[PDB]
UniProtKB/Swiss-Prot annotation:
Gene Ontology terms describing biological process: adenylate cyclase-inhibiting G protein-coupled receptor signaling pathway; circadian rhythm; G protein-coupled receptor signaling pathway; G protein-coupled receptor signaling pathway, coupled to cyclic nucleotide second messenger; mating behavior
Parts of the chain on the Extracellular side: 64-81, 143-166, 428-440
Function according to Swiss-Prot or TrEMBL: High affinity receptor for melatonin. Likely to mediate the reproductive and circadian actions of melatonin. The activity of this receptor is mediated by pertussis toxin sensitive G proteins that inhibit adenylate cyclase activity. Possibly involved in sleep induction, by melatonin activation of the potassium channel KCNMA1/BK and the dissociation of G-beta and G-gamma subunits, thereby decreasing synaptic transmission.
Keywords noted in UniProt: Cell membrane, Disulfide bond, G-protein coupled receptor, Glycoprotein, Membrane, Receptor, Transducer, Transmembrane, Transmembrane helix
Regions that span the bilayer: 9-29, 43-63, 82-102, 122-142, 167-187, 407-427, 441-461
Protein name, entry field: Melatonin receptor type 1A
Keyword flag Isomerase: no
Organism whose genome encodes this protein: Homo sapiens (Human)
GO-annotated molecular function: G protein-coupled receptor activity; hormone binding; melatonin receptor activity
Localization per Swiss-Prot or TrEMBL: Cell membrane
PANTHER family in alphabetical order: B2 BRADYKININ RECEPTOR/ANGIOTENSIN II RECEPTOR, MELATONIN RECEPTOR TYPE 1A
């Protein structure tokens, strides 16, 4: 390593210390100052700012002095405490990040189900549990003797080579586990935003339908040359592994032998596999209560169908966003759909029948259950379907930018700490052999990239959040503009 490399690392820490202290003090002040930033959900933000602030006050300055000293001149006590506080900061950061991810996911869910805004009643209570969990994780390292000075990075930290069992547990429980939780939270938020964006209440609206539902159904069934009965509808691509038309076709065959089949009517709409197109056409010939439509219908006629049929069958294997289920629910069509992502998020227990995907027996039984439902039970189901669709459209004028800032805060944390945890696993495999087998440049960059993270969040809040940006300017001016008397 050259001479300039040591001076380069010192610049990174000097920048980190200054931007951490000044920036995170602004983050704390802004939450207190701004009325819009002042909320229970932002207690986790202050807790994360405190976590970041800890390392800048005592650990980082000792690391900076150690670069110029080219060794540890502060004894064992300062080495033990400096390493312990680095643990509390790093562990506290990832768990506060999960705390925000769970808080935000619970916010969108509350916003859909209720008219009153989400108030994080136990926000401070969860923050106190995070620091009780953080303390429980970093404390065993003092008695285990896994905290020591590393000459390569000029600091006292957790030695990945002391105990592999401690190293693996740190990676698994305090990186992999929190990440899985966070990814699941932001993936579920993103799908719910696309469903809010996707729905169109100006098109999929009962206002466009003139007559009564019973009148519209009798008219629809008469056009297809069928009498009155519980009408079921399918509208999807004909394939063997995605939309599940094959599950529906096999379910009709199971039902055809039953005495209850006479009371049923089926409208299968779609195109795809010619073999599946033939199977549907075969059932259409054998049974006068089964009608197949292979041509492509207009949105106008599909909307007419949703407002006429009793049930919409969504027997999909994989469905990311159940826009079809919401569009059907808009016009009071009760969905019988597979318990798959998107569909499980849309269809509640009071707004439809949920079925195990890829089971023709479970679908046939669900169709039998749907059949034995009186006009009164049906009217309440349709009412609930409409109420559920309304809550999605309700969230359209909302500003979803805060969800993006929080996601960037996490994404940058993951980028900063991913190489360190990968090196951790590589060292844990063979502590004696992998220590020289790992390049010094990679090890040094991974630690200082992780250190640089302690000053990133105040920069992110300023660049992406308008409330934080406005307050940074407000505080900077207020503290530098003198009061005078003319
Ligand atoms: C796999 C290890 C890794 O890459 N990163 C965690 C090292 C962090 C940062 C400093 C510090 C101090 C004490 C402590 C821990 C840490 C984990 C639990 O005890």
């Amino acid at each position: 390593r050259p001479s300039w490399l040591a001076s380069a690392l010192a610049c990174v820490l000097i920048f980190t210390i200054v931007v951490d202290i000044l920036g995170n003090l602004l983050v704390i002040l802004s939450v207190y100052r701004n009325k819009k930033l002042r909320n229970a959900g932002n207690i986790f933000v202050v807790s994360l700012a405190v976590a970041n602030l800890v390392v800048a006050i005592y650990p980082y300055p000792l690391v900076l002095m150690s670069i110029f000293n080219n060794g540890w001149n502060f004894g064992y006590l300062h080495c033990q405490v400096s390493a312990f506080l680095m643990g509390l900061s790093v562990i506290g950061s990832i768990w506060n990040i999960t705390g925000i991810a769970i808080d935000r996911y619970l916010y969108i869910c509350h916003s859909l189900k209720y008219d009153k805004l989400y108030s994080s009643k136990n926000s401070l209570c969860y923050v106190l549990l995070i620091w009780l969990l953080t303390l429980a994780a970093v404390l065993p390292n003092l008695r285990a003797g896994t905290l020591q000075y590393d000459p390569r990075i000029y600091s006292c930290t957790f030695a990945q080579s002391v105990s592999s069992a401690y190293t693996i547990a740190v990676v698994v429980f305090h990186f992999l586990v929190p990440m899985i939780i966070v990814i699941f939270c932001y993936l579920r938020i993103w799908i719910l935003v696309l469903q809010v964006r996707g729905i169109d209440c100006s098109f999929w609206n009962e206002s466009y339908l003139t007559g009564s539902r019973d009148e519209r159904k009798k008219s629809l069934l008469s056009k297809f040359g069928m009498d009155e009965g519980v009408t079921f509808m399918f509208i999807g691509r004909f394939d063997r592994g995605q939309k599940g038309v094959d599950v529906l076709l096999k379910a009709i065959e199971i039902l055809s032998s039953k005495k209850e089949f006479q009371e049923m009517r089926f409208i299968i709409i779609g195109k795809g596999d010619p073999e599946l197109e033939g199977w549907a056409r075969s059932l259409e010939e054998k049974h006068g209560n089964v009608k197949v439509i292979t041509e492509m219908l207009s949105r106008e006629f599909v909307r007419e169908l949703y407002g006429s049929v009793d049930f919409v069958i969504i027997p999909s294997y994989f469905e990311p966003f159940g826009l079809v289920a919401l569009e059907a629910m808009c016009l009071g069509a009760i969905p019988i759909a597979s318990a798959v992502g998107g569909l499980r998020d849309i269809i509640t227990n009071e707004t439809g029948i949920l079925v195990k995907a890829g089971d023709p027996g479970e679908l046939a039984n669900a169709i039998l259950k749907a059949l034995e439902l009186s006009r009164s039970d049906l009217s309440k189901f349709r009412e609930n379907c409409k109420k559920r669709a309304m809550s999605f459209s309700k969230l359209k004028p909302q500003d979803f930018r805060n969800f993006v800032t929080m996601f960037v805060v996490f994404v940058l944390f993951a980028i900063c700490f991913a190489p360190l945890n990968f090196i951790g696993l590589a060292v844990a495999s063979d502590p004696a052999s992998m220590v020289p087998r790992i390049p010094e440049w990679l090890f040094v960059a991974s630690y200082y990239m992780a250190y640089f993270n302690s000053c990133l969040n105040p920069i992110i809040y300023g660049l992406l959040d308008q409330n934080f940006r406005k307050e940074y300017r407000r505080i900077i001016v207020s503290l530098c503009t003198a009061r005078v008397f003319f």
